[PDB]
Structure 1
Amino acid sequence: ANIDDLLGDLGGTARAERAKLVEWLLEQGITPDEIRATNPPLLLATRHLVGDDGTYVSAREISENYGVDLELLQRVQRAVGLARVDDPDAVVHMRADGEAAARAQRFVELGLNPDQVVLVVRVLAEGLSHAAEAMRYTALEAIMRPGATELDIAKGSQALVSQIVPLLGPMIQDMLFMQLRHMME
């Protein structure tokens, strides 16, 4: 099994546990290049559901592609605070993360202050990254059972995130407006 070179240094009971996972990952459309560049491979057949497709871009690439100001965009990228960033040409931004930052420009175009917009992003990124860890453990509790293998987790993880994701979007959307309805007074 030449896939013996995606297993690396893993031995014992864990090498068989990994081999079965790589078996299922490869047969999902996942390529050897992604598996090698991701330890643990676990979340590979799952990360596509939250918008991550392994495609990376640079701030300048985002700036030209989506027709946005580079300076303001990179301010918003510091505000979300996700990738070690400060070079317009570092291809280190997830394609979807890049498109998400390009929308901030639109709020500034509606007369809202670019200093304030960047601040709102900062507060949101702070609040959502705390809910993120509450979300991580909630799902992990739901998919970790007796003595499940790597594959068991990857299969359970893919199944659960698939059902959950269509709900999360309109959920948090409903949540934000609930706060907007009660901060109003």
Structure 2
Amino acid sequence: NIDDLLGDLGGTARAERAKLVEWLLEQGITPDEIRATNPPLLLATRHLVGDDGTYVSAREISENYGVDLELLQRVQRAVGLARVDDPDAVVHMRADGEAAARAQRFVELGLNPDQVVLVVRVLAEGLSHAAEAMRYTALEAIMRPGATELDIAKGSQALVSQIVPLLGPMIQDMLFMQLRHMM
């Protein structure tokens, strides 16, 4: 039964949530994932940006990718998306752990760890602004008059599915373009 996924909701909101929850289950999402995510609207879109629901600790990342734990935690701080600053706290999205684990390779090439950590810090800040600009841009395109939660979920998955393949190549090209025009 869905009802506990629906909770306190009533009226039109509960009816729209029912049809959304129904579509997500067919999408292969669990009751378990829907409870932990409010609103459940973006569950069939987050996997397109690499959130599969898996979480890891800094120590797991360290051992699994063979990187220095302390350096890793500096990078996690510099990105600044999860707090719990405990090496055994399982609070990092898998893809975030793996991304943070790349930083050490720059260090092994002789780059200064302080400076690497600083770059990550400035990049994260610049990208967090672009992210928010990106969010608004996408919403404008998805959000149409009188749309239900399910309409929005379907429209978001379609649009983000088409955008994601382009975003990676683009950001990469934009970085190298800035690096071509240093001085």
TM-score above 0.5: yes
The alpha carbon displacement at 1:85 in A equals 2.9
Q: What value does the CA root-mean-square deviation take over the aligned residues?
A: 0.5
1:44-59 equivalence runs, <5 A:
44-59=43-58
Q: Deviations over 1:115-149 (max 9, x none)?
A: 00000000000000000000000000000000100
Q: Deviations over 1:33-79 (max 9, x none)?
A: 00011110000011001000000000001010000000000000000
Task: Note if contact 1:58-1:92 (Cα within 8 Å) is conserved in structure 2.
Answer: yes
Q: What is the CA–CA distance in structure 1 between the aligned matches of 2:54 and 2:75, rounded to whole Å?
A: 20
Q: What is the CA–CA distance in structure 1 between the aligned matches of 2:12 and 2:119, rounded to whole Å?
A: 48
The alpha carbon displacement at 1:5 in A equals 1.3
The alpha carbon displacement at 1:8 in A equals 0.4
Matched residue pairs, number? 183
Task: Note if contact 1:78-1:85 (Cα within 8 Å) is conserved in structure 2.
Answer: no
The alpha carbon displacement at 1:84 in A equals 1.1
Q: What is the CA–CA distance in structure 2 between the aligned matches of 1:130 and 1:111, rounded to whole Å?
A: 30
Q: Deviations over 1:10-40 (max 9, x none)?
A: 0011100000000100000000000011110
Task: Note if contact 1:46-1:157 (Cα within 8 Å) is conserved in structure 2.
Answer: yes
Q: Deviations over 1:148-178 (max 9, x none)?
A: 0000000000000000000000000000000
Q: TM-score, normalised by structure 2?
A: 0.99
Query: Match of 1:83, SS?
Result: coil
Q: What is the CA–CA distance in structure 1 between the aligned matches of 2:145 and 2:122, rounded to whole Å?
A: 39
Q: What is the CA–CA distance in structure 2 between the aligned matches of 1:84 and 1:102, rounded to whole Å?
A: 17
Query: Match of 2:6, SS?
Result: coil
The alpha carbon displacement at 1:4 in A equals 1.1
Q: Deviations over 1:68-100 (max 9, x none)?
A: 000000000000001013100000000000000
Q: Which contiguous aligned blocks of 4+ residues in structure 1 show a shift greater than 3 angstroms?
A: none
Q: What is the CA–CA distance in structure 1 between the aligned matches of 2:77 and 2:18, rounded to whole Å?
A: 39
